[PDB]
Amino acid sequence: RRKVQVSYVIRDEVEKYNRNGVNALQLDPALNRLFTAGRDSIIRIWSVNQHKQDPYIASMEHHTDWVNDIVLCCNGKTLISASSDTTVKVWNAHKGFCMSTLRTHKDYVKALAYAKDKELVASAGLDRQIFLWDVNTLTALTASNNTVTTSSLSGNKDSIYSLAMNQLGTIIVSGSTEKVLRVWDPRTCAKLMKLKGHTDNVKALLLNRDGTQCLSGSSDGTIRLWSLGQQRCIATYRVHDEGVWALQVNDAFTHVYSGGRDRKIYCTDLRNPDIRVLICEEKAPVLKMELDRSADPPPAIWVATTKSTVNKWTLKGIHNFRASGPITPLCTQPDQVIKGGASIIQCHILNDKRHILTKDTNNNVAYWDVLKACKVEDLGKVDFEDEIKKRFKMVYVPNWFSVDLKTGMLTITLDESDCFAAWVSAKDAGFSSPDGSDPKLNLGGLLLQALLEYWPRTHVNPMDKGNGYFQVPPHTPVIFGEAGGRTLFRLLCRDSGGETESMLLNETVPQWVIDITVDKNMPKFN
């Protein structure tokens, strides 16, 4: 039995730019469209024509935690996504909307593998379980028939960080903290071999068309070539002076593109390792890369890092630089830059247990109101640690919420255990009521009431509006999730009115919330 937590995000109606690093990239050459999977929990669509003042197309927001991987199938018609919210989501990629949500995984969904030819896709995570999926079966799901037959892969002892399938979908390999790679036949689900060789966790896997050989990059700093025939590591290339997290290959399976912690991007000739071209040196560790496959040799490479900015680097002059060459990079500046937003990297809950001070990646300090789920002031580039001090309030209020910053935005979480703990005077809370004054308001209560304001159940029946003090921004996402893991339901505050929304709120809203919002049984103060 898992308890349920109500959480919300303090953000704007629209987040045009990534508010954290990008985990996964997916390029549509047909429509010149890029897909960025964000740690900000939002997938975004961009136009990569190169000549446009603003490349922003749309943003897909259903996920409640990091978006770890994305897969663009059916000639760019469908998008499958993997998230730390424990779910896999099917999206109409052309029109940009959510279609189905697979809640089969019990923990973070870390990677996706794709068999272009057989139109198959697999998902693995910290579950230690891999799930195979037919894309056509997924594309025809949500309605009256949400019937899902789960085809799993067994063996993984540890948490999965990488997945790869060959074009034909005859081979499937997993990478984990077990250091060892496990191979299977995706069509039969049968175990093939268990390849031993790596020293650390494998964050990047790559397979050739026929699935005869596999390329792997591990946190040990090496790229390893494997023969699935010979059933072992046929070669080892030490390319990076630290962890290697992202790999890409040409169609020949001869030139490998790599990046990871050391920020350097390299093309390395597997045939002649001597030939190793430094494409560029990024401003943050490389998390994922996506080659432009419009031409052979690939004309450009799209690069995702720890930063919010996404870049394209031209590979146009490699061959000419290869014949004619203190390590000088091919590129110094990116060909195309997709702009990024700021991430809140430091936060301080003030002594009143209502105000929050934050510092972001641009060094901008800002004051926030948790209870009214909003920003209050932008203090600018003030000294943050001095600001924390300046704003010392000599008061005590019990902790009634937790804070997370894994999206680069403020996410507040309420738990049954301490949601109602903070009892403050109305005059104190800045809620002057002249002159039938100073009642003792419960902060967590009022906040819950404001969050579920548009829920009709919280008005009247009878069983024979708001909280009365404030309103939360109506676009405020209200998330319902198991404390242990699984995210249950995400809706906007303003959407609680809708009949199908209210129907879902009725099944997910836990009792501890029903008591105060619906039953109006406000807690007792002593």
- Return residues touching Au ion (CB under 5 A): 74, 98, 101, 119, 135, 233, 236, 255, 267, 269, 277, 318, 347, 349, 403, 405
Q: How far is the CB of 101 from Au ion (least distance, A)?
A: 4
C-alpha to C-alpha distance for 298 and 438, rounded to whole angstroms: 69
Q: How far is the CB of 210 from Au ion (least distance, A)?
A: 22
Q: Is the peptide bond before 477 cis (omega within 30 degrees of 0)?
A: no
Report the 10 Å Cβ neighbour count for 208: 17
- Look up residue 452 and give its DSSP letter: T
DSSP for 33-88 reads: EEEEEETTS-EEEEE-SS--S--EEEEE---SS-EEEEEEETTTTEEEEEETTS-E
Output 34 or 350, the one with its CB closest to Au ion. Answer: 350
Element (H, E) at 451: helix 443-451
Alpha carbon distances (Å) from 297 to 48, 118, 280: 19, 25, 17
Diameter of the chain measured on Cα atoms: 88
Report the 10 Å Cβ neighbour count for 242: 14
Cβ-Cβ contacts under 8 Å for 224 (sequence gap 6 or more): 197, 198, 215, 216, 217, 218, 233, 235, 236, 237
C-alpha to C-alpha distance for 88 and 78, rounded to whole angstroms: 13
237-242: long-range contacts, CB 8 A cutoff, minimum separation 24: 237/268, 237/270, 237/273, 239/266, 239/268, 239/276, 240/264, 240/266
Element (H, E) at 160: strand 160-165
Residue nearest to Au ion (CB): 347
Output 159 or 351, the one with its CB closest to Au ion. Answer: 351
Output 253 or 469, the one with its CB closest to Au ion. Answer: 253
Output 101 or 442, the one with its CB closest to Au ion. Answer: 101
Output 58 or 74, the one with its CB closest to Au ion. Answer: 74
Q: Which amino acid is at 375?
A: K
Output 269 or 415, the one with its CB closest to Au ion. Answer: 269
Report the 10 Å Cβ neighbour count for 89: 24
Output 88 or 310, the one with its CB closest to Au ion. Answer: 88
Output 44 or 62, the one with its CB closest to Au ion. Answer: 62
Output 172 or 279, the one with its CB closest to Au ion. Answer: 279
Output 385 or 438, the one with its CB closest to Au ion. Answer: 385
Q: How far is the CB of 62 from Au ion (least distance, A)?
A: 6
Output 318 or 518, the one with its CB closest to Au ion. Answer: 318
Q: How far is the CB of 198 from Au ion (least distance, A)?
A: 9
Q: How far is the CB of 224 from Au ion (least distance, A)?
A: 6
Are 445 and 523 within 8 A, CB to CB? yes
Are 215 and 223 within 8 A, CB to CB? yes
Output 233 or 509, the one with its CB closest to Au ion. Answer: 233
Q: How far is the CB of 69 from Au ion (least distance, A)?
A: 17
Half-sphere exposure in the Cβ direction for 518 (13 Å, CA): 16
The DSSP bridge pattern shows strands 286-291 and 109-115 to be unpaired
C-alpha to C-alpha distance for 355 and 474, rounded to whole angstroms: 20
The DSSP bridge pattern shows strands 244-249 and 232-238 to be unpaired
Q: How far is the CB of 256 from Au ion (least distance, A)?
A: 8
